[PDB]
C-alpha cells in the first residue's frame, strides 16, 4: 500500500461523472481522544 493517498466511498455517488463534481471539496474525519486539548476558538467560545 501507499499511505499518503486515501480512497473514500460516498453514498449515492456511483459513476465517474458523479465523482468529478466533488473534485476540490473539503473532507473531514472526526474522532475523540482521551483528554481535552486545544482547539479553534479555545478562549473565544469555551463551549467548544
Amino acid at each position: 500500500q501507499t499511505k499518503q493517498t486515501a480512497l473514500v466511498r460516498v453514498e449515492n455517488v456511483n459513476t465517474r461523472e458523479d465523482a468529478t463534481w466533488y473534485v476540490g471539496k473539503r473532507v473531514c474525519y472526526v474522532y475523540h481522544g482521551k483528554k481535552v486539548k486545544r482547539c479553534v476558538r479555545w478562549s473565544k467560545a469555551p463551549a467548544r
Binding site: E11, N12, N14, T15, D18
Partner: protein, 178 residues
C-alpha cells in the same frame, strides 16, 4: 454494435522495368480492421498467386466500399479455413444481417466459435445477397414468414447505470444501500 471489419478495395501492380514496361493492374476485395492489414493481405495474395513481391510493386489505390441502406436480407458467404489436421476446408453458409460487412463479421465470429479458427487462417471467397426462395436452411428460412411473431421470455433487464442499487426493499422499489 457496428461490425468490427470494413470492406476494402485495393488496386495495385508490379513496378515497371525493362523486362515488363507495361505491367498488369490487379483489383482485390478484402475485409480487414484497417487499411494496413488490407494492404498486407493484398500483398500476400499477390505473392502467392502472381509471384510478385511487395518490394517490387506499387499500390495505386486503397479505398473503402460504402455499405448500402440497412434492410433485413439473406447473405450467402463462401468461406474457407486451414487447420493442421484436415488441411483446407471450404464451406458455404447463410446469415441474416443488414450489410455485407455485418454478415462477414458474423461469419468470422461463427467460425471462431464452432471450429476455433482465427483471422489469419481464414480466406473469404465470396459474399452476396440472395432472394428468399433460394434459401436452403430452415433455420434461416423461418425468419421470412409473412406472419412472424413471438414473445420475449426469460428476460434479464438491468436498470439504468445511474439508478442501479445494491440493497432494495423486498416488494418495493426503495433503495436501501446505494
Amino acid at each position: 454494435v457496428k461490425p468490427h471489419l470494413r470492406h476494402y478495395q485495393v488496386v495495385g501492380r508490379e513496378s515497371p522495368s525493362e523486362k515488363n514496361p507495361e505491367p498488369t493492374v490487379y483489383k482485390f476485395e478484402v475485409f480487414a480492421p484497417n487499411f494496413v492489414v488490407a494492404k498486407s493481405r493484398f500483398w500476400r495474395m499477390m505473392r502467392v498467386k502472381n509471384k510478385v513481391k511487395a518490394t517490387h510493386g506499387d499500390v495505386l489505390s486503397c479505398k473503402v466500399v460504402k455499405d448500402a441502406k440497412l434492410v433485413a436480407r439473406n447473405y450467402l458467404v463462401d468461406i474457407a479455413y486451414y487447420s493442421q489436421r484436415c488441411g483446407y476446408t471450404r464451406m458455404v453458409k447463410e446469415f441474416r444481417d443488414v450489410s455485407k460487412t455485418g454478415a462477414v463479421s458474423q461469419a468470422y465470429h461463427d467460425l471462431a466459435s464452432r471450429h476455433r479458427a482465427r483471422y489469419h487462417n481464414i480466406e473469404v471467397l465470396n459474399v452476396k445477397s440472395i432472394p428468399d426462395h433460394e434459401v436452403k436452411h430452415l433455420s434461416i428460412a423461418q425468419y421470412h414468414a409473412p406472419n412472424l411473431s413471438f414473445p420475449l421470455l426469460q428476460r434479464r433487464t438491468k436498470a439504468t447505470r445511474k439508478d442501479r442499487a445494491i440493497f432494495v426493499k423486498k416488494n418495493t422499489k426503495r433503495a436501501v444501500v446505494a
